[PDB]
Structure formats: C-alpha cells, structure tokens
Amino acid sequence: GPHMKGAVLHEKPMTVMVLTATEPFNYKEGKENMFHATVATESKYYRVKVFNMDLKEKFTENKFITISKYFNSSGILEINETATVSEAAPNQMFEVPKNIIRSAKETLKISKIKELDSGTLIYGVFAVEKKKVNDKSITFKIKDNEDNIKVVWDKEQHNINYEKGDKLQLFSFHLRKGNGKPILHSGNHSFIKGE
Amino acid sequence: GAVLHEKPMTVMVLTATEPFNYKEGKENMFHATVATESKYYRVKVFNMDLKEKFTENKFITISKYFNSSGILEINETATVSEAAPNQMFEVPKNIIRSAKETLKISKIKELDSGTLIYGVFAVEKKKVNDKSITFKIKDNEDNIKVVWDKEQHNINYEKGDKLQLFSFHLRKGNGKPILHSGNHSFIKGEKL
DNA sequence: CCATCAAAGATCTTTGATGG
DNA sequence: CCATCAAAGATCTTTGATGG
C-alpha cells in the first residue's frame, strides 16, 4: 500500500504545475530514494511526497504534469510506483493565482505552528539560534520574530548538509505538543537542509 | 565541613566491610560501624593499614580523626591503637540494635537532600541501563529507587534478594526521592 | 495484532549552589 | 577556583493510544 498509512487512493486524473522539488534522498535504509515537491492547481497548492525516482525529470519547476492513482493523506499527496504521471497537454495548462504561489512558499509563524494539532506535518524555512549534536539525535533551536521551538532529528546524521549560520529548511516534520512543551520531530519522510 | 577531633575516643568495632575501590587512582577504603557506651557511629576508613584493627568486638582508641556530620572518617593522619582494658566497657544492647537497624523508607524520604543513607532493604525490581543500574527497594510501608552510576559492572541481586547500602545520597529533586550512589557508596547483598 | 508515533516518563548531561 | 553533588535541563527510552 501507500507509504503514508490511511492515505486514500485517488484514481481521477489531476493536472498540476510543479512549483519546487528537492533533490532525492534516502529516507529509510534499504529503500529507494524519495523527494519532496510542491505543486499547484488554479485553486490550491499541495505538498507532495514522491517515491518513484523515474519521475525526477517530470518534477521540473514550472512544468505541468497530470497525476492519477496518487494517494491523499490529510492533504499531503503521495506519488508512488502505482501512480500514472504524464506531461500535461498545452490545453490543460493554466495560471496559478499569486496568492496561491505566495502561500505555497510561505513559512508559518512559530507561535501559529504551536496551535496546530499534534502529528501535523510542518514545512518551512527558519532562523537557527543553536545547533546541538548528540549521539542519538541532532537538535536545533529555531526562531522567528516572536517565538522559538526545538527541532529534533533522531535519524541518520551523516548526510545532513547544514553549515554554520545557514537558515534551516524543514520538510515533513511532525508537531508534538507533548503537554505544553511542543517540539518538531523527524518522522519517516522528514528532510532537513541548510539554506 | 568536617570537624577534626584530636582527643582520643575508645570504641568497640561492631561491623566492617572488606576494602573496595571507591575512586580510580585512590587507595581502597572500607566502611565500619563502632560504638561507645552511649552512641554508635558509622565510620569510613581510608588507611588500609588499619584493616586488622577493625575486627568484630575489638576495642580501639581513635585520635586525630574527622567527624563529618556524624560520620567518622579515618585517614592516614589518624592514630588508631588497641584500647587499654581500663578504657573498655559494655555497649548496651539497645545501642547495638540501633546500629543494625534500618530506617523505614517513609522516614528516609522526609530527610534533607544530601543526607547519607545506610541500610538493608528488600529488592522489588532491578533495571540495567546503558550507564546505570537502578533498583526498586521496599519495606512494609513504602518503596524507593536506588541509582548506581559508578562502575557499570554486574550487581548480581534481583527481586527477592536483600540489598545492603552504605553511604548512599538522598536526592529529592522533582518531588521524586531517590537514593543515589556517591563518592563512598558501596553495595553488599544477600542472594535470596 | 503488529506498526506507528506521540505522550509520558526515565536516564543522562549540564548548570549552579556551596565550601574549603 | 577545584571539588562536591543535587537540581535543572536535555536527551533517550518506554508506554499507550490508534489504525491498517
């Protein structure tokens, strides 16, 4: 089945414009690489997790593609081996509204992130106040104008590309509210990179 | 701070442990318990030349020793002699019994953080961690966690056994009282 | 009934208070 | 201005709730 549990299959074809995509990366040892992308329709942007590396080229910025038999997990799309992805016909193309492009690249305030439900996937670019390397984890204190929060990565550390002073790019991190002590924690598909 | 007592005191030796390594690069130490006519004292001995002197029921006269909040500490600068008969005496039965008794855990929990704790307790559970070994000990009223993080070698006691503790430190932090190993801590046990 | 992953809690490391 | 050492704080593990 889908890499995201509970994800629902959508057979109906949908045409999107690719806004951005990450390099592929190893998310789990012994498994094929994945990448993250953001795509948009005339009315909505979607975060997308792509598990078929045949599709690297099709996820080029500003390209229009038609996707079918993809999975939807709480608004996050998953494209795996069973999906069909083709280049869109010129007649299937459209203009993405500016507000949608803007929202797709925006990062929520940390204070607002903290109000979301536990388990919500968090994406964004944040200033780093401190980085701490431990044996079983790397932690970051990230911050903005108004607030700060801890980011916890407990996965393989070798391939993280982050340099002192960089802003931190987060993809698919999980909000954990704990009990008034919230953090962002890596999960199965999380990706982290300096900007 | 510990108080130096230059004047001689004659005591009877009640019990003493075998010597053990308490700190890397240091001479061994042992624990003992001794008594006068009127009081018992727990004792820490750091001069191993004195081990034969600390045999059960022996009367010894101690001088230039330290009293550290009720615990006597005997190092190289102390003088320890065999007592003269005229300094010998009878240790009353209630003093000997008090020397051997263990505080209820419910009373231990009320003491100040940092108080040194000794006693014999039933073991309820043992857990081995990466860098510590912990035990749950109990009596008829209460239970408490013991933490050993000094050497990470096997402590071969488990549920049903009895654990004898020497100079463990009470920590109350977080409203969660524990007994924690410290500089001079030692564990003996009775296998089941 | 395993797998998941967040909440709860234990363990481990750092800080800070105290004294000599 | 070392040495202790317990609390605070951070990391790490265990537990418990959910869902295919």
UniProtKB/Swiss-Prot annotation, chain A:
Changing G178W: Strongly reduces affinity for DNA. Changing K141A: Strongly reduces affinity for DNA. Changing S137E: Abolished DNA-binding. Residues 5-195 form the HIN-200 domain. It is found in: Cytoplasm; Nucleus. Changing N134E: Abolished DNA-binding. The record marks H36 as: Mediates interaction with TP53BP1. Changing K150A: Strongly reduces affinity for DNA. Changing H174E: Abolished DNA-binding. Transmembrane segments: none annotated. Phosphorylated. Changing K136E: Does not affect DNA-binding. Signal peptide: none annotated. Changing S118E: Reduced DNA-binding. DNA-binding protein involved in innate immune response and has anti-inflammatory activity. Inhibits caspase activation in response to cytosolic DNA by preventing activation of the AIM2 inflammasome, probably by sequestering cytoplasmic DNA and preventing its being bound by AIM2. Also inhibits activation of the AIM2 inflammasome via a direct interaction with AIM2, which prevents the interaction between AIM2 and PYCARD and formation of the AIM2 inflammasome. Binds double-stranded DNA (dsDNA) in the cytosol. Homomultimer; homotetramerizes (via HIN-200 domain 2), enhancing affinity for double-stranded DNA (dsDNA). Interacts (via HIN-200 domain 2) with AIM2 (via HIN-200 domain); preventing activation of the AIM2 inflammasome. Binds to several transcription factors, including NF-kappa-B p50 (NFKB1) and p65 (RELA), FOS, JUN, E2F1, E2F4, MYOD1 and myogenin. Also binds TP53/p53, the hypophosphorylated, growth-inhibitory form of the retinoblastoma protein and the p53-binding protein 1 (TP53BP1). Belongs to the HIN-200 family. This is Interferon-activable protein 202. The gene is Ifi202. The chain holds residues 53 to 243 of 445 of the full protein.
From Swiss-Prot, chain B:
Changing K176A: Strongly reduces affinity for DNA. GO terms for cellular component: cytoplasm; nucleus. Induction: By beta interferon. By IL6 in splenocytes (at protein level). Changing N183A: Does not affect DNA-binding. Strongly reduces affinity for DNA. GO terms for biological process: activation of innate immune response; cellular response to interferon-beta; inflammatory response; innate immune response; negative regulation of AIM2 inflammasome complex assembly; negative regulation of innate immune response; protein homooligomerization; protein homotetramerization. The HIN-200 domain 1 mediates non-specific double-stranded DNA (dsDNA)-binding via electrostatic interactions: it recognizes both strands of DNA. The HIN-200 domain 2 mediates homotetramerization and interaction with AIM2. Homomultimer; homotetramerizes (via HIN-200 domain 2), enhancing affinity for double-stranded DNA (dsDNA). Interacts (via HIN-200 domain 2) with AIM2 (via HIN-200 domain); preventing activation of the AIM2 inflammasome. Binds to several transcription factors, including NF-kappa-B p50 (NFKB1) and p65 (RELA), FOS, JUN, E2F1, E2F4, MYOD1 and myogenin. Also binds TP53/p53, the hypophosphorylated, growth-inhibitory form of the retinoblastoma protein and the p53-binding protein 1 (TP53BP1). This is Interferon-activable protein 202. It comes from Mus musculus. The chain holds residues 54 to 245 of 445 of the full protein.
